[PDB]
Amino acid sequence: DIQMTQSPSSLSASVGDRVTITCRASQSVSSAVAWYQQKPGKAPKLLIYSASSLYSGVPSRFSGSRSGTDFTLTISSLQPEDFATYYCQQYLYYSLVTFGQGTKVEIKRTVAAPSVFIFPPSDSQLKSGTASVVCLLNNFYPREAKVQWKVDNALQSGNSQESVTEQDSKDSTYSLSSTLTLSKADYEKHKVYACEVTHQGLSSPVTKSFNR
Amino acid sequence: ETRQWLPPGESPAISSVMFSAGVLGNLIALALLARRWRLSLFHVLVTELVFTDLLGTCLISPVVLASYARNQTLVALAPESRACTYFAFAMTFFSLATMLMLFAMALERYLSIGHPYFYQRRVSRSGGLAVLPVIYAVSLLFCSLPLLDYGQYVQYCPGTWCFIRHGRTAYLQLYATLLLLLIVSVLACNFSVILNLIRARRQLADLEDNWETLNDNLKVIEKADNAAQVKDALTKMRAAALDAQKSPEMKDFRHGFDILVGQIDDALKLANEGKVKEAQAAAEQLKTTRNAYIQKYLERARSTLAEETDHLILLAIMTITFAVCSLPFTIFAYMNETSSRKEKWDLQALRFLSINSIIDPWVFAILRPPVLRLMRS
Amino acid sequence: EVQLVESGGGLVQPGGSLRLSCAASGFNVRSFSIHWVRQAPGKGLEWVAYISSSSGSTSYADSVKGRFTISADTSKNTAYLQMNSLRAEDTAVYYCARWGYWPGEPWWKAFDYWGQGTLVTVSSASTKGPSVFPLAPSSKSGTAALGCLVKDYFPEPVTVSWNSGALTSGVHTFPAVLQSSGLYSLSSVVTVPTYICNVNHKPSNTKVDKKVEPK
Amino acid sequence: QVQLQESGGGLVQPGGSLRLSCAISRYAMSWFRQEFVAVARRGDGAFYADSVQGRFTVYLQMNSLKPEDTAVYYCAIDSDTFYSGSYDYWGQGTQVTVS
Ligand SMILES: CCc1nnc(NS(=O)(=O)c2ccc(NC(=S)NC(=O)CCc3ccc(F)cc3)cc2)s1
């Protein structure tokens, strides 16, 4: 029951930089450690087998190394075709196969100010019976951010769904959408709504409020 | 430079004991090496090393021993300065050839331990006997140069040494250049073997550690009633087998674990189905297969590493006792004679140059085959 | 060349059964063990099944023991996996792979060829048309943001376009999110310095349009 | 509660250098100009702003200054361990002028 633990979970870099990924095994494994590259919306592909040799077909930019029970995947120079999720796998036995947590390399850029917008429920959405308030975070970086809902100056816990997009082709600026769903009675009884955004790059958390 | 004057109170105490110790060490070394002759590629080189010291001692030493009757040891015993012509040529010949013999010993360990391919390559033991004429042939050509007109021999202060004299002729610089390069070459081979031996010790330690992992977990399977403990013990054994597996013995060593891992997969196959008794039955057959092939390689690995490190200890002590003695001659030759008004490093270089040939046979006499204490200390 | 094609995936009601098939091309299944791996949306990989057609041994994950049954057919050179008593966490993607037997070089080359994989969704709900709700910006609002919110749609794939694909600058489409009721949700926003948002739903065959005006 | 203070500053010339040292391991540090400057989290790397990328390096080693850099530089520590940008321990700040 070996549990593979992958320490690198999120790393941002550009082309030409060196990337180092570490894979840790709960039990000692001689050479049964492999690295796989899975692109979004595509099947994974084996990069390094036995942690020493290179797969027939993959570029020579990837390399593998071993030290005790720690395995290292090294990328000398990044390329626009090498931006995909990386997985560590053990294959000590046919019935003993456990994957890690994954590692998706990102494109680093300059930090910008996120634009925060608020959208109240429309009239048709109110007539439907469920009121959904939307909080939009456009052009922010990195992916790590926080959004909090405040109704009548009272924090809300739960009932909020967050959705984050991927990096755009032009600029690696993610987009975040937070939807808060409630009933018609809760929308009519409460007076004002607001969403507060805390993210790296802002001195003060940016608040966006609406009043019915 | 002819130093005829000598104090009358000169006693042959140092010369006699030195010659006696040298000849006794040479005879003892030859007698002890003859016990092996009925012997390895490294041992046959040691036979020629003590033989060169014995041959030189019988030619260099008796010259000054008989000449101790008169106050002047040796000014001109024979016409045309044949007395020094025989003494200086002998000391120059048996000094470079003896160092070249050490290079053959260092190169042998370098090719055998450093390169596995050269070990598999056939190196005839009788070819080692042909090394002695080759070493004497190369040394004779280089030592024939001072016999010409440009070569000069002068009598030192004690009156018994007439080695090469530093002058405008560029031969003493070249003679020390060969000795200095040989010292670096022998030390480079020793440093390479030491690094190879240290890497060999870690490989044997990891191989022994994987051997202990297999045996320890095997006893757990015999007393494991639950199938979960059987599968856990076989898991560590399978990983240890793949780590241990990483020439006829090399092919058999890989094939030994290839069939061994397959037995682990069969035992793991029965463990998944729930057959605990059947899994323990395959574990008993695993011990017989492992001892048949894997254990044989471990016994040869411990024996080979122990035999080769003993030859390194014999080589390490000899090169140390060649280095400390040859360094005074290296500094003396490079430094100009006009720099020192009363040169004293010259006489010191003469002493160590003769002492090292005497210490070498006694080194083998002290370092006996029971060097297990020196091997692991 | 070596290819592995998966089939049989789709929508399955909870408590039912599903038969997935993996067909290999370029080699024989009797010389390579067949492995089935599962990957959940927004997570990593997880091995779920293994079979060795050379000897007939089978193995499954500890969480799926007693519910999955894997088999291999050498006459058709394929693998069949039967899944009974499915749960809500089974919504994932299944991939098929091969692994060489010990010893040899293909053994160390674990999972050298990965199949395309098929999607499995286990949810107890009925299909519903995409309810499009327009999002209007504030009356006070340089930069402006307009959006159309689509909710209460059962099928996973949905396409949202602005101005029939003409306005594609600053248009960001957010991934679907599973609500508590079991119906996905999706929103799309567009940054502008008429605006019609078109939502074309292929499985439901329902086209809904809305007009967005500033408040 | 944690007191944050950095040494150095004053009047600098264009093209010079300035090594500021704010004063941890598990948390992330950030610099602000009064505008975001740079952030250092771990070995997860560091991020810079628009005009900060290339010129500055984060220990903030300001190099290749421009006449627009003259402003007060602060220091903040992210309380959240998920890099959520929750800054509450704001330092006093030091006055820095360029040319
Ligand atoms: C040592 C301190 C003194 N220095 N001068 C002194 N006055 S002395 O008593 O009259 C005297 C003492 C010793 C010698 N040298 C002898 S005997 N050398 C050799 O046998 C071998 C040489 C050699 C043999 C083989 C070989 F491979 C390499 C070298 C001559 C004169 S003592």
Domain identity same for A12 and A101 = yes
Structure tokens given for C158: 């949905």
* DSSP 8-state code for residue C29: G
Please state the separation of Cα C68 from the chain's center in Å: 20
Residue ranges per structural domain of chain B? 13-197+326-375, 202-300
Angle at A104 between CA A103 and CA A105, to 5 degrees: 115
A-chain CB neighbours of B216 within 8 Å are none
In a shared domain, residues C11 and C33: yes
Q: Is there a single domain that holds both residue C161 and residue C91?
A: no
Residue type for position C110: A
Same domain, C137 and C106: no
CA gap C186, C178 in Å, rounded: 9
A119 near C62, Cβ under 8 Å?
no
Radius of gyration of chain A (CA): 23
Whole-angstrom distance, CA of residue B85 vs CA of residue B76 = 10
Method used experimentally: cryo-EM
> Token pair for residue C88?
């809500």
Cβ(B164)–Cβ(B156) below 8 Å: no
Burial class (CB in 10 A: 0-12, 13-18, 19+), C173: middle
Nearest to C103 among B258, B269, B272 (CB): B258
Chains that touch C (3 or more CB pairs under 8 A): A, B
Tokens of B169: 């002729």
Give yes or no for residue B354 CB within 6 A of ligand 1.
yes
Task: Put residue C104 in one of left, alpha, beta given phi > 0 → left and psi -120 to 50 → alpha.
Answer: left
Pairing of strands C159-162, C196-201: antiparallel
Q: Are residues A89 and A135 in the same domain?
A: no
Q: Choose among C103, C111, C101, C104: nearest CA to C35.
A: C111
Ligand 1 binding pocket mutation candidate from B6, B11, B14, B321 (most atoms within 8 A of CB)? B14
- The alpha carbon of B170 and the centre of ligand 1 are apart by a number of angstroms equal to 26
CA atoms of B252 and B259, how far apart (whole Å) = 11
Unique residue bearing structure tokens 């999972």: C111
First to last CA, chain B: 52
Q: How many folded domains does chain C comprise? A: 2
Give the nearest chain C residue to B272 (CA atoms): C59
Interchain proximity B265–C102, CB inside 8 Å: yes
The backbone region for A120, taken as left when phi is positive above 0, alpha when psi lies in -120 to 50, beta otherwise, is: beta
Nearest by CB to residue C59, choosing from B258, B261, B272, is B272
Residue C26: how many other CB atoms lie within 10 Å: 10
Q: Quick check: A13 contacting D, CB < 8 Å? A: yes
Non-local (6+) Cβ contacts of B238 within 8 A are: A92, A93, B261, B264, B265, B268
Reply yes or no on domain B202-300 having CATH 1.10.150.530: no
Which of A49, A56, A97 to substitute to test the interface with C, most C CBs within 10 Å? A97
Type of residue at C57:
S
**Rounded-to-integer distance, Cα B207 and Cα C80, Å:** 43
Give residue C65's Cα distance to chain centre: 23
Rounded Cα distance between A136 and A189, Å, is 24
The structure tokens 């411990």 sit at: B302
State whether C34 and C110 are in the same domain. yes
> Is residue C98 domain-shared with residue C28, that is, in the same domain?
yes
| Dihedral sign, Cα of residue B212, residue B218, residue B219, residue B224 | positive
Chain breaks in chain C (C to N over 2.5 A) after: 141, 193
DSSP summary character for residue A124: H
Query: For residue B350, how far is its CA from the centre of ligand 1 (angstroms)?
Result: 8
In angstroms, the Cα distances linking A51 to A77, A99, B10 are 19, 15, 75
Out of A31, A136, A162, the one facing C189 most closely (by C-beta) is A136
Give the amino acid at B129. L
Whether residues A81 and A169 share a domain: the answer is no
Find, in chain C, the residue whose alpha carbon is nearest to that of B265.
C102
Q: Strands of D1-99 (E only): list them.
A: 6-7, 10-12, 17-22, 28-33, 36-40, 46-48, 60-63, 71-78, 87-90, 94-98
In degrees rounded to 5, what are phi and psi of residue A14?
Answer: -125, 180
Output the six-digit token pair for B200: 């060999």
Total structural domains within chain A = 2
**C85 and C33 belong to one structural domain:** yes
Question: Quick check: C66 contacting B, CB < 8 Å?
Answer: no
Same domain as C189, residue C137: yes
Write out the two tokens for D86.
């929750």
Q: Of the residues C52, C87, C122, which one is the last residue of a structural domain?
A: C122
Please state, in angstroms and as integers, the Cα–Cα distance from residue A135 to each residue in A111, A149, A156, A172, following that order.
Answer: 20, 9, 14, 20
State the distance between the two ends of chain A, measured CA to CA, in whole angstroms: 57
Q: Which of C122, C144, C163 is the last residue of a domain?
A: C122
**Closest residue on chain B to A29 (Cα):** B239
Chosen from D29, D52, D87 to mutate, greatest number of chain A CBs within 10 A: D87
CA B286 to chain centre: 42
Task: Assess if residue D85 is contained within a domain.
Answer: no
d(CA A47, CA B211): 32
Query: Both A168 and A189 in a single domain?
Result: yes
Same domain, A120 and A199: yes
Three-point CA angle D2, D8, D11, nearest 5°:
135
- Does residue D86 belong to any structural domain of this protein? no
- A32 near B CB under 8 A: yes
Q: What is the 3-state secondary structure (H, E, C) of chain B?
A: CCCCCCCCCCCCHHHHHHHHHHHHHHHHHHHHHHHHCCCCHHHHHHHHHHHHHHHHHHHHHHHHHHCCCCCCCCCCCCHHHHHHHHHHHHHHHHHHHHHHHHHHHHHHHHHHHHCHHHHHCCCCHHHHHCHHHHHHHHHHHHHCCCCCCCCCECCCCCCCCCCECCCCCCCHHHHHHHHHHHHHHHHHHHHHHHHHHHHHHHHHHHHHHHHHHHHHHHHHHHCCCCHHHHHHHHHHHHHHHHHHHCCHHHHHHHHHHHHHHHHHHHHHHHHHHCCHHHHHHHHHHHHHHHHHHHHHHHHHHHHHHHHHHHHHHHHHHHHHHHHHHHHHHHHHHHCCCCCCCCCCHHHHHHHHHHHHHHHHHHHHHHCCCCCHHHHCC
Closest ligand 1 atom, CA of B94?
A: 27
Which residue in chain C has the smallest CA separation from B238? C102
Of C105, C122, C139, the residue at which a domain comes to its end is C122
State how far the Cα of D29 lies from the Cα of D35, in Å rounded to an integer: 15
3-class SS of residue A20: strand
Q: Regarding the domain delimited by B13-197+326-375, which CATH topology (the fold level of the hierarchy) does it fall under? A: Rhopdopsin 7-helix transmembrane proteins (1.20.1070)
Q: The domain spanning residue D12 has which CATH number?
A: 2.60.40.10
* Residues of C with Cβ-Cβ distance to A49 under 8 angstroms: 108-110, 112
Paired strand residues for A133: A180
Residue C21 · residue C80 · CB < 8 Å = yes
A136 forms bridges with which residues in the sheet? A117, A177
Inform me whether the C-beta atom of residue A68 falls under 8 Å from chain B C-beta atoms: no
Residue at token pair 């119906």: C183
Instruction: For residues C16 and C112, give the distance between their C-alpha atoms in angstroms, rounded to a whole number.
Output: 33
C139 dihedral zone (left: phi>0; alpha: psi -120 to 50; beta): alpha
Report CA torsion sign: B108, B109, B114, B117.
Answer: positive
Helix/strand/coil percentages in chain A, nearest 5? 5, 50, 45
Strands A62-67 and A70-75: antiparallel
Q: For residue C179, which residues of chain A lie inside 8 Å, CB to CB?
A: 161, 181
Q: Specify the 3-state DSSP secondary structure of C2.
A: coil
Quick one: closest CA in D to A196, which residue? Answer: D86
* In the block, residue with structure tokens 């006829």: B248
Contact yes or no for A200/D38 (Cβ under 8 A): no
Q: What is the dihedral of CA A88, A90, A91, A96, to 10 degrees?
A: -130
3-state SS assignment for residue A186: helix
Give the gap in angstroms from C-alpha C171 to the nearest C-alpha of chain B.
52
Q: Measured between alpha carbons, how far is B329 from A174 in angstroms, rounded to an integer? A: 77
Which of B68, B160, B362 for a ligand 1 pocket mutation test, highest count of atoms within 8 Å of Cβ? B160
Cα angle: B100, vertex B102, B108; to 5 degrees: 105
Amino acid making up residue A188: E
| CA dist., res. A58 & res. A52, Å (int) | 14
- Count: domains in chain D: 1
CATH number of the domain at A172, please: 2.60.40.10
Give the Cα separation of B40 and D55 in Å (integer). Answer: 69
Please give the single-letter amino acid code of residue D47.
F
* Full domain range(s) for residue C154: 131-211
In the reported structure, the alpha carbon of residue B84 is separated from the centroid of ligand 1 by a whole-number distance in angstroms of: 14
Give the relative orientation of helices B345-366 and B41-66 as an angle to the nearest 10 degrees.
130
Three-state DSSP class for residue D98 = strand
Residue D44 lies in a domain: yes
Contact B347, B289 (CB under 8 A): no
Q: Is A118 on the interface with D (CB under 8 A)?
A: no
The answer to whether A198 contacts chain D (CB < 8 Å) is: yes
Determine, yes or no, domain membership for D54. Answer: yes
What does the alpha-carbon distance between residue A179 and residue A120 come to, in Å, rounded to a whole number?
10
- B66, with CB counted inside 10 A (0-12, 13-18, 19+), is exposed
Contact D95, D71 (CB under 8 A): no
B15 lines ligand 1 (CB under 6 A): yes
Q: Does the CB atom of residue B92 touch ligand 1 within 6 A?
A: no
For residue D84, tell me if it sits in a domain: no
Assess A164–D contact: CB distance below 8 Å, yes or no: no
Residue D71 lies in a domain: yes
| Residue C138 DSSP one-character state | P
Query: Taking the CA of residue C201 as centre, how many other CA atoms within 13 Å lie in the half-sphere pointing to its CB?
Result: 21
Instruction: Please name which of B21, B12, B74 lies closest in space to residue B355, comparing C-alpha atoms.
Output: B21
Q: What tokens were used for C80?
A: 């069949």
Burial class (CB in 10 A: 0-12, 13-18, 19+), D82: exposed
Cα separations (Å) of C113 from A56, B182, B279, C35, C78? Answer: 12, 57, 33, 11, 15
- Is the CB of B3 inside a 6 Å radius of any atom of ligand 1? no
Q: Which residues, at least 6 apart from C10, have a Cβ–Cβ distance to it below 8 Å?
A: C18, C118, C119, C120, C121
Of D8, D2, D16, D3, the residue nearest D67 (C-alpha): D16
Domain interval for residue A123: 115-211
* Residue A142 preceded by cis peptide, ω within 30: yes
Ligand 1 atom nearest B65 alpha carbon: 17
Burial string for A201-210 (b: 16+ CB within 10 Å, else e) reads bbeebbebee
Asked if A160 reaches chain C (Cβ–Cβ under 8 Å), the answer is no
Angle at which helices B227-245 and B172-222 cross, to 10°: 160
Contact call for residues D90 and D76 (beta carbons, < 8 A): yes
Out of D34, D36, D86, closest to residue A201 by CB: D36
> Does C57 sit within 8 Å of B272, measured CB to CB?
yes
Nearest residue to A25 via CA among A90, A76, A109: A90
Q: CA-CA distance, C51 to C57, in Å (whole number)?
A: 6
Q: How many CB pairs under 8 A join A and B?
A: 32
Domain holding D22, by residue range, is 6-77
Measured distance CA(B231)–CA(B287) in Å, rounded: 17
Q: Which residues make Cβ contacts (< 8 Å) with residue A124, sequence separation at least 6? A: C133, C134
Chosen for mutation from A22, A110, A146, A197 (greatest number of chain D CBs closer than 10 Å) is A110
Same domain, C146 and C198: yes
In whole angstroms, give the CA distance from residue B171 to residue B285.
72
Region for residue B214 given its phi and psi (left: phi exceeds 0; alpha: psi -120 to 50; beta: otherwise): alpha
Residue type at position A139: N
* Contact assessment for residue A76 and residue A157, using Cβ atoms and an 8 Å cutoff: no
Report if residue D50 sits inside a domain.
yes
Which helix (H) or strand (E) covers residue C187, if one does? strand C184-192
CA-based nearest residue to B84, from B187, B4, B189, B9: B4
Report how far ligand 1's centroid is from the alpha carbon of B351 (Å). Answer: 6
C-alpha B368 – ligand 1 centre gap (Å): 27
Stretch (H or E) spanning A184: helix A184-189
Q: Does the N-terminal peptide bond of residue C103 adopt cis geometry, omega within 30 degrees of 0?
A: yes
Nearest CA in chain B to A96: B235
**What are the contacts of C127-130 at 24+ separation with CB within 8 A?**
C127/C154, C127/C155, C127/C203, C127/C204, C128/C152, C128/C153, C128/C154, C128/C183, C128/C204, C129/C153, C129/C201, C129/C204, C129/C206, C129/C208, C130/C158, C130/C199, C130/C201, C130/C204, C130/C206, C130/C208
CB B160 less than 6 A from any atom of ligand 1: yes
For ligand 1, atom 6, which residue shows the shortest CA distance?
B158
